[PDB]
Amino acid sequence: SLFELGKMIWQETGKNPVKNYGLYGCNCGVGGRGEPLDATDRCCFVHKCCYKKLTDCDSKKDRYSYKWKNKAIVCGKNQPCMQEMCECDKAFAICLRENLDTYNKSFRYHLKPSCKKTSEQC
């Protein structure tokens, strides 16, 4: 769920997830997907694409178990759909950390309606 995702992002990047990624670029947070503006934005594009494989659970409200130990994220003993959700989130959180070096403050609160549709598939 959003609660696990938020915690992961905070644990990996040390930044508040809502403020820093709630409206970032054309793919992070609210809204759907669009042509990614940068690496961070791309992380969000891939993440939302990942959620497509979830057919029996809610990536928004459904809770799953995971552990943050030894600076690593480990998905716990979850049902198939929940585990897939956890792995989607895990890869996303790592992706964000990997691209902190190009995080753009000007993209933090982006005008999503100005985003263009992409031709790239999931």
Coordinates of all heavy atoms in Angstrom, one line a residue, residues 22-116, unseen atoms left out:
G22 N 5.4 13.5 -4.8 CA 4.0 13.5 -4.9 C 3.4 14.1 -6.2 O 2.4 13.8 -6.6
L23 N 4.2 15.1 -6.7 CA 3.8 15.8 -8.0 C 5.0 16.0 -8.9 O 4.9 16.9 -9.8 CB 3.2 17.1 -7.6 CG 2.3 17.0 -6.5
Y24 N 6.1 15.2 -8.7 CA 7.3 15.4 -9.5 C 7.1 14.9 -11.0 O 6.6 13.9 -11.3 CB 8.4 14.6 -8.8 CG 9.8 14.8 -9.4 CD1 10.7 15.6 -8.7 CD2 10.2 14.3 -10.6 CE1 12.0 15.9 -9.3 CE2 11.5 14.5 -11.1 CZ 12.3 15.3 -10.5 OH 13.6 15.5 -11.0
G25 N 7.7 15.8 -11.9 CA 7.6 15.5 -13.3 C 6.3 15.1 -13.9 O 5.2 15.5 -13.4
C26 N 6.4 14.2 -14.9 CA 5.2 13.7 -15.6 C 4.7 12.4 -15.2 O 3.7 11.9 -15.6 CB 5.4 13.7 -17.1 SG 5.9 15.3 -17.8
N27 N 5.4 11.7 -14.3 CA 5.0 10.3 -13.9 C 5.0 10.1 -12.4 O 4.3 9.1 -11.9 CB 6.0 9.3 -14.5 CG 5.9 9.2 -16.0 OD1 5.0 8.5 -16.5 ND2 6.7 10.0 -16.7
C28 N 5.6 10.9 -11.6 CA 5.6 10.7 -10.1 C 4.3 11.2 -9.4 O 3.8 12.3 -9.7 CB 6.8 11.4 -9.5 SG 8.4 11.0 -10.3
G29 N 3.8 10.4 -8.5 CA 2.6 10.8 -7.7 C 1.3 10.8 -8.4 O 1.0 9.9 -9.2
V30 N 0.5 11.8 -8.2 CA -0.8 12.0 -8.8 C -0.8 11.9 -10.3 O 0.2 12.2 -10.9 CB -1.4 13.3 -8.4 CG1 -1.8 13.3 -6.9 CG2 -0.5 14.4 -8.7
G31 N -1.9 11.4 -10.8 CA -2.0 11.2 -12.3 C -1.5 9.9 -12.8 O -1.1 9.0 -12.1
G32 N -1.5 9.8 -14.2 CA -1.1 8.6 -14.8 C 0.4 8.7 -15.3 O 1.2 9.3 -14.6
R33 N 0.6 8.3 -16.5 CA 2.0 8.3 -17.1 C 2.1 9.3 -18.2 O 1.1 9.8 -18.7 CB 2.4 7.0 -17.6 CG 2.9 6.0 -16.4 CD 3.3 4.7 -17.0 NE 2.2 3.9 -17.5 CZ 1.9 3.8 -18.8 NH1 2.8 4.3 -19.7 NH2 0.9 3.1 -19.2
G34 N 3.3 9.6 -18.6 CA 3.6 10.6 -19.7 C 5.0 10.5 -20.0 O 5.8 9.7 -19.3
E35 N 5.5 11.2 -21.0 CA 6.9 11.2 -21.4 C 7.8 11.7 -20.2 O 7.6 12.8 -19.8 CB 7.2 12.0 -22.6 CG 8.2 11.5 -23.5 CD 8.3 12.2 -24.9 OE1 7.5 13.2 -25.1 OE2 9.2 11.9 -25.7
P36 N 8.6 10.8 -19.7 CA 9.5 11.1 -18.5 C 10.5 12.3 -18.8 O 11.1 12.3 -19.9 CB 10.2 9.8 -18.2 CG 10.1 9.0 -19.5 CD 8.8 9.4 -20.1
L37 N 10.5 13.2 -17.9 CA 11.4 14.4 -18.0 C 12.9 14.1 -17.7 O 13.8 14.7 -18.3 CB 10.9 15.5 -17.1 CG 9.6 16.2 -17.6 CD1 9.2 17.2 -16.5 CD2 9.8 16.9 -18.9
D38 N 13.1 13.2 -16.8 CA 14.5 12.8 -16.4 C 14.5 11.4 -15.8 O 13.5 10.7 -15.8 CB 15.0 13.9 -15.5 CG 14.2 14.0 -14.2 OD1 13.3 13.2 -14.0 OD2 14.6 14.8 -13.3
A39 N 15.7 11.1 -15.3 CA 15.9 9.8 -14.7 C 14.9 9.5 -13.5 O 14.4 8.4 -13.5 CB 17.3 9.6 -14.2
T40 N 14.8 10.4 -12.6 CA 13.8 10.3 -11.5 C 12.4 10.0 -12.1 O 11.7 9.1 -11.6 CB 13.8 11.5 -10.6 OG1 15.0 11.6 -9.9 CG2 12.7 11.4 -9.6
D41 N 12.0 10.8 -13.0 CA 10.7 10.7 -13.7 C 10.6 9.3 -14.3 O 9.5 8.7 -14.2 CB 10.5 11.7 -14.7 CG 9.1 12.1 -14.9 OD1 8.2 11.6 -14.1 OD2 8.8 12.9 -15.9
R42 N 11.7 8.8 -14.9 CA 11.7 7.5 -15.5 C 11.4 6.4 -14.5 O 10.7 5.4 -14.7 CB 13.0 7.2 -16.2 CG 13.2 7.9 -17.5 CD 14.0 7.1 -18.5 NE 13.4 5.7 -18.7 CZ 12.5 5.4 -19.6 NH1 12.0 6.4 -20.5 NH2 12.0 4.2 -19.7
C43 N 12.0 6.5 -13.3 CA 11.7 5.6 -12.2 C 10.2 5.4 -12.0 O 9.7 4.3 -11.9 CB 12.4 6.1 -10.9 SG 14.1 6.3 -10.9
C44 N 9.6 6.5 -11.9 CA 8.1 6.6 -11.7 C 7.3 6.0 -12.8 O 6.3 5.3 -12.6 CB 7.7 8.0 -11.4 SG 8.4 8.6 -9.9
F45 N 7.9 6.1 -14.1 CA 7.2 5.6 -15.2 C 7.2 4.1 -15.1 O 6.2 3.4 -15.3 CB 7.9 6.0 -16.5 CG 7.3 5.5 -17.8 CD1 6.3 6.2 -18.4 CD2 7.7 4.3 -18.3 CE1 5.8 5.7 -19.6 CE2 7.1 3.8 -19.4 CZ 6.2 4.5 -20.1
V46 N 8.4 3.5 -14.9 CA 8.6 2.1 -14.7 C 7.8 1.5 -13.6 O 7.2 0.5 -13.7 CB 10.1 1.7 -14.5 CG1 10.3 0.3 -14.1 CG2 10.9 2.1 -15.7
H47 N 7.7 2.3 -12.5 CA 7.0 1.8 -11.3 C 5.5 1.7 -11.6 O 4.9 0.7 -11.3 CB 7.1 2.8 -10.2 CG 6.4 2.5 -8.9 ND1 5.4 3.3 -8.4 CD2 6.5 1.4 -8.1 CE1 4.9 2.7 -7.3 NE2 5.6 1.6 -7.1
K48 N 4.9 2.7 -12.3 CA 3.5 2.6 -12.6 C 3.2 1.5 -13.7 O 2.2 0.9 -13.7 CB 3.0 3.9 -13.2 CG 2.9 5.0 -12.0 CD 2.3 6.3 -12.5 CE 1.9 7.2 -11.3 NZ 1.7 8.6 -11.6
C49 N 4.2 1.2 -14.5 CA 4.1 0.1 -15.5 C 4.1 -1.2 -14.7 O 3.4 -2.1 -15.1 CB 5.3 0.1 -16.4 SG 5.2 1.4 -17.7
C50 N 4.9 -1.3 -13.7 CA 5.0 -2.5 -12.9 C 3.7 -2.8 -12.2 O 3.3 -4.0 -12.2 CB 6.1 -2.2 -11.8 SG 6.9 -3.7 -11.2
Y51 N 2.9 -1.8 -11.8 CA 1.6 -2.1 -11.2 C 0.6 -2.7 -12.1 O -0.4 -3.2 -11.6 CB 1.1 -0.7 -10.6 CG 1.6 -0.3 -9.3 CD1 1.2 0.9 -8.7 CD2 2.4 -1.1 -8.5 CE1 1.6 1.2 -7.4 CE2 2.9 -0.8 -7.2 CZ 2.4 0.4 -6.7 OH 2.8 0.8 -5.4
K52 N 0.9 -2.7 -13.4 CA -0.1 -3.2 -14.4 C -0.3 -4.7 -14.2 O -1.4 -5.2 -14.5 CB 0.4 -3.0 -15.8 CG 0.7 -1.5 -16.0 CD -0.2 -0.9 -17.1 CE 0.1 -1.4 -18.5 NZ -1.1 -1.9 -19.2
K53 N 0.7 -5.5 -13.8 CA 0.7 -6.9 -13.6 C -0.2 -7.3 -12.4 O -0.5 -8.5 -12.2 CB 2.1 -7.5 -13.4 CG 2.6 -7.3 -12.0 CD 3.9 -8.1 -11.8 CE 5.1 -7.3 -12.1 NZ 5.9 -7.9 -13.2
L54 N -0.6 -6.4 -11.5 CA -1.4 -6.6 -10.4 C -2.8 -6.8 -10.8 O -3.5 -5.8 -11.1 CB -1.2 -5.5 -9.3 CG 0.2 -5.2 -9.0 CD1 0.2 -4.1 -7.9 CD2 1.0 -6.4 -8.5
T55 N -3.4 -8.0 -10.7 CA -4.7 -8.2 -11.1 C -5.7 -8.6 -10.0 O -6.9 -8.6 -10.1 CB -4.8 -9.3 -12.2 CG2 -4.3 -10.5 -11.7
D56 N -5.1 -9.0 -8.8 CA -5.9 -9.4 -7.7 C -5.7 -8.7 -6.4 O -6.1 -9.2 -5.3 CB -5.7 -10.9 -7.5 CG -6.0 -11.7 -8.7 OD1 -7.2 -12.0 -9.0 OD2 -5.1 -12.1 -9.4
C57 N -5.2 -7.5 -6.5 CA -5.0 -6.7 -5.3 C -4.9 -5.2 -5.6 O -4.7 -4.8 -6.7 CB -3.7 -7.2 -4.5 SG -2.1 -6.8 -5.4
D58 N -5.1 -4.4 -4.5 CA -5.0 -2.9 -4.6 C -3.7 -2.4 -4.2 O -3.4 -2.3 -3.0 CB -6.2 -2.3 -3.8 CG -6.5 -0.9 -4.2 OD1 -5.5 -0.1 -4.3 OD2 -7.7 -0.6 -4.3
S59 N -2.9 -1.9 -5.1 CA -1.6 -1.3 -4.8 C -1.7 0.0 -4.0 O -0.7 0.5 -3.5 CB -0.9 -1.0 -6.1 OG -1.4 0.2 -6.8
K60 N -3.0 0.5 -3.8 CA -3.2 1.7 -3.0 C -3.5 1.4 -1.6 O -3.0 2.0 -0.7 CB -4.3 2.5 -3.7 CG -3.9 3.9 -4.1 CD -4.6 4.3 -5.4 CE -5.8 5.2 -5.0 NZ -5.6 6.6 -5.3
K61 N -4.5 0.5 -1.4 CA -4.9 0.2 0.0 C -4.4 -1.1 0.6 O -4.3 -1.3 1.8 CB -6.4 0.2 0.0 CG -7.1 0.6 -1.3 CD -8.6 0.2 -1.2 CE -9.5 1.2 -1.9 NZ -10.2 2.0 -0.8
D62 N -4.1 -2.1 -0.2 CA -3.6 -3.4 0.3 C -2.2 -3.4 1.0 O -1.2 -3.0 0.3 CB -3.7 -4.5 -0.8 CG -5.1 -4.8 -1.2 OD1 -6.0 -4.5 -0.4 OD2 -5.3 -5.4 -2.3
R63 N -2.2 -3.8 2.2 CA -0.9 -3.8 3.0 C -0.2 -5.1 2.8 O -0.7 -6.2 2.6 CB -1.3 -3.7 4.5 CG -1.9 -2.4 4.9 CD -0.9 -1.3 5.0 NE -1.2 -0.4 6.1 CZ -0.4 0.3 6.9 NH1 0.9 0.0 6.7 NH2 -0.8 1.1 7.8
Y64 N 1.2 -5.0 2.8 CA 2.0 -6.2 2.7 C 3.2 -6.1 3.7 O 3.4 -5.0 4.3 CB 2.6 -6.3 1.3 CG 3.4 -5.1 0.8 CD1 4.7 -4.9 1.3 CD2 2.9 -4.2 -0.2 CE1 5.4 -3.8 0.8 CE2 3.7 -3.2 -0.7 CZ 4.9 -3.0 -0.2 OH 5.7 -1.9 -0.6
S65 N 3.9 -7.2 3.9 CA 4.9 -7.2 4.9 C 6.3 -7.1 4.2 O 6.6 -7.8 3.2 CB 4.8 -8.4 5.8 OG 6.0 -8.6 6.6
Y66 N 7.2 -6.3 4.8 CA 8.5 -6.2 4.3 C 9.4 -5.7 5.5 O 8.9 -5.2 6.5 CB 8.6 -5.2 3.2 CG 8.9 -3.7 3.6 CD1 10.2 -3.2 3.6 CD2 7.8 -2.9 3.9 CE1 10.4 -1.9 4.0 CE2 8.0 -1.5 4.2 CZ 9.3 -1.1 4.3 OH 9.5 0.3 4.6
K67 N 10.7 -5.9 5.3 CA 11.6 -5.5 6.4 C 12.8 -4.6 5.9 O 13.3 -4.8 4.8 CB 12.2 -6.7 7.1 CG 11.2 -7.6 7.7 CD 10.6 -7.1 9.0 CE 9.6 -8.0 9.6 NZ 9.0 -7.4 10.8
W68 N 13.2 -3.6 6.7 CA 14.3 -2.7 6.3 C 15.4 -3.1 7.3 O 15.4 -2.6 8.4 CB 13.8 -1.3 6.5 CG 14.9 -0.3 6.4 CD1 15.4 0.5 7.5 CD2 15.7 0.1 5.3 NE1 16.4 1.3 7.0 CE2 16.6 1.1 5.7 CE3 15.7 -0.3 4.0 CZ2 17.5 1.7 4.8 CZ3 16.6 0.3 3.1 CH2 17.5 1.2 3.5
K69 N 16.3 -4.0 6.8 CA 17.4 -4.4 7.7 C 18.7 -4.4 6.9 O 18.8 -4.8 5.8 CB 17.1 -5.8 8.2 CG 15.8 -6.3 7.8
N70 N 19.8 -4.0 7.6 CA 21.1 -3.9 7.0 C 21.1 -3.0 5.7 O 21.7 -3.4 4.8 CB 21.6 -5.3 6.7 CG 21.4 -6.3 7.9 OD1 21.7 -5.9 9.0 ND2 20.8 -7.4 7.6
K71 N 20.3 -2.0 5.8 CA 20.2 -1.0 4.7 C 19.6 -1.7 3.4 O 19.9 -1.2 2.3 CB 21.6 -0.4 4.4 CG 22.1 0.4 5.5 CD 21.2 1.5 5.9 CE 22.0 2.6 6.8 NZ 22.0 2.2 8.2
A72 N 18.9 -2.7 3.6 CA 18.3 -3.4 2.4 C 16.8 -3.6 2.7 O 16.3 -3.7 3.8 CB 19.0 -4.8 2.2
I73 N 16.0 -3.7 1.6 CA 14.6 -3.9 1.6 C 14.3 -5.4 1.3 O 14.8 -5.8 0.2 CB 13.8 -3.0 0.6 CG1 13.9 -1.5 1.0 CG2 12.4 -3.4 0.5 CD1 13.7 -0.6 -0.1
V74 N 13.6 -6.1 2.2 CA 13.3 -7.5 1.9 C 11.8 -7.7 2.1 O 11.3 -7.6 3.1 CB 14.1 -8.4 2.9 CG1 14.0 -9.8 2.5 CG2 15.5 -7.9 3.1
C75 N 11.2 -8.1 0.9 CA 9.8 -8.4 0.9 C 9.5 -9.7 1.8 O 10.2 -10.7 1.6 CB 9.3 -8.6 -0.5 SG 9.6 -7.1 -1.5
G76 N 8.6 -9.6 2.7 CA 8.3 -10.7 3.6 C 7.4 -11.8 3.0 O 7.2 -11.9 1.8
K77 N 6.8 -12.6 3.9 CA 5.9 -13.7 3.5 C 4.5 -13.2 3.1 O 3.6 -13.1 4.0 CB 5.8 -14.7 4.7 CG 7.2 -15.3 5.0 CD 7.1 -16.3 6.1 CE 8.4 -16.9 6.4 NZ 8.6 -17.6 7.7
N78 N 4.3 -12.8 1.9 CA 3.1 -12.3 1.4 C 2.4 -13.2 0.3 O 3.1 -14.1 -0.2 CB 3.3 -10.9 0.7 CG 3.9 -9.9 1.7 OD1 5.1 -9.6 1.6 ND2 3.2 -9.4 2.6
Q79 N 1.2 -12.9 0.1 CA 0.4 -13.6 -1.0 C 1.0 -13.1 -2.3 O 1.6 -12.0 -2.3 CB -1.1 -13.3 -0.9 CG -1.7 -13.7 0.4 CD -1.6 -15.2 0.7 OE1 -1.8 -16.0 -0.1 NE2 -1.1 -15.5 1.9
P80 N 1.0 -14.0 -3.3 CA 1.5 -13.6 -4.7 C 1.3 -12.2 -5.1 O 2.3 -11.5 -5.4 CB 0.8 -14.6 -5.6 CG 0.5 -15.8 -4.7 CD 0.3 -15.3 -3.3
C81 N 0.1 -11.7 -5.2 CA -0.2 -10.3 -5.6 C 0.5 -9.3 -4.8 O 1.1 -8.3 -5.3 CB -1.7 -10.1 -5.7 SG -2.1 -8.9 -7.0
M82 N 0.5 -9.5 -3.5 CA 1.1 -8.6 -2.5 C 2.6 -8.6 -2.6 O 3.2 -7.5 -2.5 CB 0.7 -8.9 -1.1 CG -0.3 -8.0 -0.4 SD -1.8 -7.8 -1.4 CE -2.4 -9.4 -1.5
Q83 N 3.2 -9.7 -2.9 CA 4.6 -9.8 -3.1 C 5.0 -9.1 -4.4 O 6.1 -8.5 -4.4 CB 5.0 -11.3 -3.1 CG 6.5 -11.5 -2.9 CD 6.9 -11.2 -1.5 OE1 6.2 -10.6 -0.7 NE2 8.1 -11.7 -1.1
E84 N 4.2 -9.2 -5.4 CA 4.6 -8.6 -6.7 C 4.5 -7.1 -6.5 O 5.3 -6.3 -7.0 CB 3.6 -9.0 -7.7 CG 3.8 -10.4 -8.3 CD 2.6 -10.9 -9.1 OE1 1.7 -10.1 -9.4 OE2 2.6 -12.1 -9.5
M85 N 3.6 -6.6 -5.7 CA 3.4 -5.2 -5.3 C 4.7 -4.7 -4.6 O 5.2 -3.7 -4.9 CB 2.2 -5.0 -4.5 CG 1.8 -3.5 -4.2 SD 0.5 -3.3 -3.0 CE -0.7 -4.4 -3.6
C86 N 5.1 -5.5 -3.6 CA 6.2 -5.2 -2.8 C 7.5 -5.1 -3.6 O 8.3 -4.2 -3.4 CB 6.4 -6.3 -1.7 SG 7.6 -5.9 -0.4
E87 N 7.7 -6.0 -4.5 CA 8.8 -6.0 -5.4 C 8.8 -4.8 -6.3 O 9.9 -4.3 -6.7 CB 9.0 -7.3 -6.2 CG 9.3 -8.5 -5.3 CD 10.7 -8.5 -4.7 OE1 11.5 -7.7 -5.2 OE2 10.9 -9.1 -3.7
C88 N 7.6 -4.4 -6.8 CA 7.5 -3.2 -7.6 C 8.0 -2.0 -6.9 O 8.8 -1.2 -7.4 CB 6.1 -3.0 -8.0 SG 5.3 -4.1 -9.2
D89 N 7.5 -1.8 -5.7 CA 7.8 -0.7 -4.8 C 9.3 -0.7 -4.4 O 10.0 0.3 -4.4 CB 7.0 -0.8 -3.5 CG 5.5 -0.5 -3.8 OD1 5.2 -0.1 -4.9 OD2 4.7 -0.7 -2.8
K90 N 9.8 -1.9 -4.1 CA 11.2 -2.0 -3.8 C 12.2 -1.5 -4.9 O 13.1 -0.8 -4.6 CB 11.6 -3.5 -3.4 CG 13.0 -3.8 -3.1 CD 13.3 -5.2 -2.8 CE 14.7 -5.6 -2.9 NZ 15.0 -7.0 -2.4
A91 N 11.9 -2.0 -6.1 CA 12.8 -1.5 -7.2 C 12.7 0.0 -7.4 O 13.6 0.6 -7.7 CB 12.3 -2.3 -8.5
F92 N 11.5 0.5 -7.2 CA 11.2 1.9 -7.4 C 12.0 2.7 -6.4 O 12.6 3.7 -6.7 CB 9.7 2.2 -7.2 CG 9.3 3.6 -7.3 CD1 9.9 4.4 -8.2 CD2 8.3 4.1 -6.5 CE1 9.5 5.8 -8.3 CE2 7.9 5.4 -6.6 CZ 8.5 6.3 -7.5
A93 N 11.9 2.3 -5.1 CA 12.6 3.0 -4.0 C 14.1 3.1 -4.3 O 14.8 4.1 -4.0 CB 12.4 2.4 -2.7
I94 N 14.7 2.0 -4.8 CA 16.1 1.9 -5.1 C 16.4 2.8 -6.3 O 17.4 3.5 -6.3 CB 16.5 0.5 -5.4 CG1 16.4 -0.4 -4.2 CG2 18.0 0.4 -5.9 CD1 16.3 -1.9 -4.5
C95 N 15.5 2.8 -7.3 CA 15.7 3.6 -8.5 C 15.8 5.1 -8.1 O 16.6 5.9 -8.7 CB 14.5 3.4 -9.4 SG 14.8 3.9 -11.1
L96 N 14.9 5.6 -7.2 CA 14.9 7.0 -6.8 C 16.2 7.3 -6.1 O 16.8 8.4 -6.3 CB 13.8 7.2 -5.8 CG 12.4 7.1 -6.4 CD1 11.3 7.4 -5.4 CD2 12.3 8.1 -7.6
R97 N 16.8 6.5 -5.2 CA 18.0 6.7 -4.5 C 19.2 6.8 -5.5 O 20.0 7.7 -5.4 CB 18.3 5.6 -3.5 CG 19.6 5.7 -2.8 CD 20.5 4.6 -3.1 NE 20.2 3.3 -2.5 CZ 20.5 2.1 -3.0 NH1 21.2 2.0 -4.1 NH2 20.1 1.0 -2.3
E98 N 19.2 5.9 -6.5 CA 20.2 5.9 -7.5 C 20.3 7.2 -8.3 O 21.3 7.5 -8.9 CB 20.0 4.7 -8.4 CG 21.1 4.5 -9.4 CD 22.4 4.1 -8.8 OE1 22.4 3.5 -7.7 OE2 23.5 4.4 -9.4
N99 N 19.1 7.9 -8.4 CA 19.1 9.1 -9.2 C 18.9 10.4 -8.4 O 18.5 11.4 -9.0 CB 17.9 9.0 -10.2 CG 18.2 7.9 -11.2 OD1 19.0 8.0 -12.1 ND2 17.4 6.8 -11.1
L100 N 19.3 10.4 -7.2 CA 19.2 11.6 -6.3 C 20.2 12.7 -6.8 O 19.9 13.9 -6.6 CB 19.6 11.3 -4.9 CG 18.5 10.5 -4.1 CD1 19.1 10.0 -2.8 CD2 17.4 11.5 -3.8
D101 N 21.2 12.2 -7.5 CA 22.2 13.2 -8.1 C 21.7 14.1 -9.2 O 22.4 15.0 -9.6 CB 23.5 12.4 -8.5 CG 23.1 11.4 -9.6 OD1 22.1 10.8 -9.6 OD2 24.0 11.3 -10.6
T102 N 20.5 13.8 -9.7 CA 20.0 14.6 -10.8 C 18.6 15.1 -10.5 O 17.8 15.5 -11.3 CB 19.9 13.8 -12.2 OG1 19.2 12.6 -12.0 CG2 21.3 13.5 -12.7
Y103 N 18.2 14.9 -9.2 CA 16.9 15.4 -8.7 C 16.8 16.8 -9.1 O 17.7 17.6 -8.7 CB 16.7 15.1 -7.2 CG 15.3 15.5 -6.7 CD1 14.3 14.6 -6.8 CD2 15.1 16.8 -6.3 CE1 13.0 14.9 -6.3 CE2 13.8 17.1 -5.8 CZ 12.8 16.2 -5.9 OH 11.5 16.6 -5.5
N104 N 15.7 17.2 -9.7 CA 15.5 18.6 -10.2 C 14.4 19.3 -9.3 O 13.2 19.0 -9.4 CB 15.1 18.6 -11.6 CG 15.3 20.0 -12.3 OD1 15.8 20.1 -13.4 ND2 15.1 21.1 -11.5
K105 N 14.8 20.3 -8.6 CA 13.9 21.1 -7.7 C 12.8 21.7 -8.5 O 11.6 21.9 -8.1 CB 14.6 22.1 -6.9
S106 N 13.1 22.1 -9.8 CA 12.1 22.8 -10.6 C 11.0 21.8 -11.1 O 9.9 22.2 -11.5 CB 12.8 23.4 -11.8
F107 N 11.3 20.5 -11.0 CA 10.3 19.5 -11.4 C 9.5 19.0 -10.2 O 8.5 18.2 -10.4 CB 11.1 18.3 -12.0 CG 11.7 18.6 -13.4 CD1 12.7 17.8 -13.9 CD2 11.2 19.6 -14.2 CE1 13.2 18.0 -15.2 CE2 11.7 19.9 -15.4 CZ 12.7 19.1 -15.9
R108 N 9.9 19.4 -9.0 CA 9.2 18.9 -7.8 C 7.6 19.1 -7.9 O 6.9 18.1 -7.6 CB 9.7 19.7 -6.6 CG 9.2 19.1 -5.3 CD 9.8 19.8 -4.1 NE 11.0 19.1 -3.5 CZ 12.0 19.8 -3.0 NH1 12.0 21.1 -2.9 NH2 13.0 19.0 -2.5
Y109 N 7.2 20.3 -8.2 CA 5.8 20.6 -8.4 C 5.6 20.9 -9.8 O 5.6 22.1 -10.2 CB 5.4 21.8 -7.5 CG 5.8 21.6 -6.0 CD1 6.7 22.6 -5.4 CD2 5.5 20.5 -5.3 CE1 7.1 22.4 -4.1 CE2 5.9 20.3 -4.0 CZ 6.7 21.3 -3.4 OH 7.2 21.1 -2.1
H110 N 5.4 19.9 -10.6 CA 5.2 20.0 -12.1 C 3.8 20.2 -12.6 O 2.8 19.7 -12.0 CB 5.9 18.8 -12.7 CG 6.1 19.0 -14.2 ND1 7.0 19.9 -14.7 CD2 5.5 18.4 -15.3 CE1 6.9 19.8 -16.1 NE2 6.0 18.9 -16.4
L111 N 3.7 20.9 -13.7 CA 2.4 21.1 -14.3 C 2.1 19.9 -15.2 O 2.3 19.9 -16.4 CB 2.5 22.4 -15.2 CG 2.1 23.7 -14.6 CD1 2.3 24.8 -15.6 CD2 0.6 23.7 -14.3
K112 N 1.6 18.9 -14.6 CA 1.3 17.6 -15.3 C 0.5 17.7 -16.5 O 0.7 17.0 -17.5 CB 0.7 16.6 -14.3 CG 1.6 16.3 -13.1 CD 1.3 14.9 -12.5 CE 2.3 14.6 -11.4 NZ 3.5 13.9 -11.9
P113 N -0.5 18.6 -16.5 CA -1.4 18.8 -17.7 C -0.6 19.1 -19.0 O -1.0 19.0 -20.1 CB -2.4 19.9 -17.4 CG -2.4 19.9 -15.9 CD -1.0 19.5 -15.5
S114 N 0.7 19.7 -18.8 CA 1.5 20.1 -19.9 C 2.3 18.9 -20.4 O 3.0 19.0 -21.4 CB 2.5 21.2 -19.4 OG 3.5 20.6 -18.6
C115 N 2.3 17.7 -19.7 CA 3.0 16.5 -20.1 C 2.4 16.0 -21.4 O 1.3 16.1 -21.7 CB 2.9 15.5 -19.0 SG 3.4 16.1 -17.4
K116 N 3.3 15.4 -22.2 CA 3.0 14.8 -23.5 C 2.8 13.3 -23.4 O 3.5 12.6 -22.6 CB 4.0 15.1 -24.6 CG 4.0 16.5 -24.9

